[PDB]
């Protein structure tokens, strides 16, 4: 399975996350799972014309392209020319057009590629967009009706960055004959990772249950849930970040950092407008503007009041102690 | 021969290199950063702490460095208090990211070029191929695989790597536990043993750090078979055999903003007190002389950059106003990189090379305080053989042992019962300067907070210093001058250009942001 | 730091778990952290008299014994003689007496050593007991007032088996000068691991919060919490099993197995009496006999009724999907 | 010379070995299992599924095997349905535990004895020391470290290892996801590549599995340097050099209960249909002839065991009534091991050696069905050179490649959308027989459920077969006879006793339970 991994408006964080892969690690993935990484801007040996030869052969169908992985945004500025992202003698978006139309499977890795992500934040100087989405709006650069040659839409491996497993396990699945096991949600994310929430497996859910808020960073995070004071989007964010730990160690929310909801297409949520960073927007000082997915403010607040009353003593004390 | 190399990959982003070649030697070079995202534009008007989220996304490999200096930018802007533990954790995570970057860059980005067919005649070529061939190289695989270990430590404290924002004004979001620290120590010790000492050095970090002169390093290579056949010993011998010590000299002038604060000396971050508090000393080395770093001396020129502007701007008044590259090229602009210049007295606004070599030079400055990196090795190497791809690379690799020891000590310094965070006052107004030594060198944020919003946000990344284009005086950037003089055996595979650009560990996503 | 690791009424599961250590792995722990493993029945080279020489030198103080690790129960049967556990020419309990009195630190690893564990289940044919506990009752073999030479009681690293980190990180702590960072709860367990609950970080807590029960094993565990139908002791069990994953992969409860509460001194709870295995004992068919720690039946059931009413749709559906 | 060795460690529990030595050769041996926990006593009256919790605690290294057969004991007792996926997962986890046991036992328990000073004169001794010295051996460290990988797969499906009970009547508790299987495959493939093929074999598993004769194996060792210097090739050469192929023969009769069910053939576990459904075939090899395994033929003798009893008991009527060892020794009893014997027609109730060698012999029986292990290698080895420490060890190591391939295929066989569990009827009454091939051999549970409680629960573990004492006919157990004939160079360090006892991978906590 040939893999061409391109970077548009990327920070390479998805590549760097990808390189943290374990089970498989990236070398074993590239070598021992029959995935022929044709080129990768961070890893491919070829430069200049030898690199472009690889790209043009993929773009024109001279050699098969099984998986086109795109990282970073599709930069369309200025004026739709894409020249704020000139790659290998073309606007990257033109490569994207050709290679997405050539690949058997197109994977957008990271929010940038999936949804436009941070570069698509207003005022979006680079005219960035995702492959098949612009934020939540289906379409993006390739259009809502784009299908790869295997009939799939762009597979969105979101996150900022994606966790290595979110792509490696999909690559393993594709390499081990389990492509048919891959189901995608409405955002084209692999449901095997994106049916759960960030909150799923968060070490603070018990505090969430009893509505016990982390009050401060640092040692303040030895207790409590980050939902109420730090704007944690854990309960509104589909991810396996607390199921499959980051770097096999932790997750934002375990460590005391609020989930930023980076797997969701609106990320960064509220465009990091003043007052929205590491803060829970509240109505009347007490009601969160956003309640957990599938809940409503009335029942959420009612249950929260009851939970506050039922809260056991340990939920009010440090638990992540030295 | 005009040669336009596109892409020149393995520089973490989009780079094209134009060179003029005469008699197989580069006589002029243009670095063209080709991809713009405009994070400084995006950050305008955002929440004052938006940088903690946005700036890490400048780069996947050095996002933690961006986080570090973005945090300290806020710490200085908001006159915060940093509990020593938070400083330690910040130091640890910054250093751990660099410890990850060092092998990951060396094997995955740099050393695979050592397998180039231009070196087929070298007696060490077969071994170079065995060790460093992409993906299958016997040094490549463990080097790359183990490079994930130091950022596990980062994740222990920051939740994840890359992509944490856990460094906040007033400290860190996390509250390490005992098992966090013990695991961090275990991970670091394992990585040090299995990659740094076993594979890279073939000796202890302490033995390597005993090398104080270039002759020491040469003696170290020959001292025994383990060091001789280590990745470091092989790399040195390979460089000396194939001539990587003979080009890529560059400006010979260096900028280190320094990083790693002695916790007791930067409990209240200010711009003015920054230099004294640094462990990894700042320092400008220019015209063979040491100067103190002063952020006030930094300007960014956009004369040959795809931005509007008619004068070099100190980043506090910086602006990022893109011009269409089609128009900019008509005006002689050729890169999305700004041209950072540094006012050195008696030299004007000069290009300064940033990176490990700059740090090692800064570490050789006189009058180091007790907490500060005092290392004469690269002063000696600079005087002995001067800069080169090899010396630049050795500077990078030299930091592995040094930073490992610092991290190991910082982990021991953590006082787990003590505070990791002092809630700051989020002032509506503030001017912040945060700077760190990312893996690739001086990484700096100049932030202006007004009306509880980001009024200005100017990032100057190390590769911007290195790879930024000619300034208004047509003075080539450090990488451009390093490219000049480079031999070109094969214009069809001009690997020497790759050697030079990648010897800076160039990061083009950081270059432009 | 010399370490002598003995096994009484053990299954060696704690050793086997210990050998799964990562960061540090067991070799790096034994070699690179200055911990001199004098002997271990599963790993020590010495046999016969060469082994006994090591033991007697530790027992008599001829050579220093810094850490005595005991795994398995202190077997006192028959009739207090301990001859159902004859080791190296003595009842193991006599070795325990001598070595615990010689060590700077005594670590009981696993429930057997900590509390008597499974062998101490009635009718307890082996007269098994823990080092300083018999089940919850403080005392065990060494007595409530036993202190090692460093002044510590037996450090109880419970579990059946202990997770490798629960001992290795303590060993790293002892080896890196952070012994003073080790605090022990009332059962002498390291609070750095045993302030959290098994439930802490369980991927099913959201289902627990909304009182959505896993109904069946296998694919039934793609949803729901195991508390209500499978007797999960997660909410009543102090452990980091869902914070620090087992084998760096999972935990009982993530996988769909109820927490058996093995870190708690009563384990096996209810002595595996008929009807208590993988079942929630309930009063009147609906009220759990045991509610989460620190809660009471009245507020727990009240909140549970409210939670059931507030439950969002996703909490009623599969989440750990293929 | 009467020699009493206590302890003989690295047999997963408490073992003392008494031997009579004449002219430096063991002429008689007694194995004394020295520690009793009484899990069969404890299980009486407990919940019918208590075995799923208790039996894994028989042993930390083979608890997953105990879980497997305890589950199948319940599956048979309760006439459950096993969805194929559950069978696959059970197969995978059982095999993964064995794949963990193989290197963990070989390096940590067995091979460090190869460094014994008795071998100092061997030309391979220095290499044996370099490779297999405890903790520092160059094969020891990766071998032991990587042995944790296969049980990561176990944990993926079972939650943890050791100490899961996720195998339940009607299937498994877990519901693997796609990433579970892909990760399990990745872990297995990495382990296979990094230990099995790189370190153990120095070749592919397929190349090793092409060895069908002893001469094939000898040719394989000499075929190339990689295989010659692999751990397997070195171990064979070391054994042949130091004489590990010359003693530890033992009974030469073998018991395999088999394990690994073809999912379609054991969807409704019964005692009677068990043999046909096995992939890893059961089989009794006795007096040079193959017999079908039949659990009805199993008896346990306690004549020389510390239990009350006057006749061999089939485990369905088994009893575990300890006698005080002080009293028992007065009656000639010397071990907490029962003496499992097997009724072979024309031979009476004989001791049978269990373990990989028994399995490999069973795998060489004629008339293998398509799903079944059909391997002539150890029939040939048995006829060529007979059993020995080396051949016994080679049988164990031979399973690594074979089981890896089975697991890899089983992982591919998983149909993730299909059921993993069929809720059984928990019948108040039931007689269950569950058996598996633990790493160490035939592991069997005979359970009697009455009145929704455990009426009887009799475990017979492989090392009980091997290390169990003399029966009523004074016939030595397999390990006892294997010890007889062993040379004793040094009565002060009688390592050959260790070689023989540990060549069975003896597990004393399993022996007694
Ligand atoms: C309303 C409300 C109040 C809290 O204190 C709280 C604490 C932790 C998580 C959530 C909440 C919450 O939703
Ligand atoms: C009373 C009650 C009912 C449930 O359905 C339930 C489901 C999951 C966890 C807990 C519970 C619970 O406590
Ligand atoms: N290192 C690094 Fe990235 C660059 N250049 C920054 O800052
Ligand atoms: N393997 C194994 Fe343990 C033994 N003997 C069992 O059963
Ligand atoms: S990691 Fe980087 S490539 Fe885009 S998705 Fe996040 S900014
Ligand atoms: S439970 Fe965790 S995911 Fe966020 S909302 Fe609370 S910190
Ligand atoms: S910000 Fe992203 S990485 Fe996970 S914790 Fe939240 S979905
Ligand atoms: S793993 Fe084994 S040693 Fe005891 S604590 Fe559990 S039965
Ligand atoms: S949240 Fe998890 S720990 Fe048990 S009680 Fe529910 S399965
Ligand atoms: S049984 Fe024990 S291992 Fe953890 S999941 Fe429960 S405390
Ligand atoms: Mg800038
Ligand atoms: Mg038995
Ligand atoms: Ni960068
Ligand atoms: Ni066992």
Author numbering:
A (entry chain D), C (entry chain G): 2 to 323
B (entry chain C), D (entry chain F): 4 to 516
Sentences reproduced from the published study:
Here we determined the cryo-electron microscopy structure of the Mycobacterium smegmatis hydrogenase Huc and investigated its mechanism. Huc uses narrow hydrophobic gas channels to selectively bind atmospheric H2 at the expense of O2, and 3 [3Fe–4S] clusters modulate the properties of the enzyme so that atmospheric H2 oxidation is energetically feasible. The Huc catalytic subunits form an octameric 833 kDa complex around a membrane-associated stalk, which transports and reduces menaquinone 94 Å from the membrane.
Because of the flexibility exhibited by this complex, we performed 3D reconstruction of the individual Huc lobe from two datasets, obtaining resolutions of 1.52 Å and 1.67 Å. The FTIR vibrational frequencies are consistent with an electron-deficient Ni-B species.
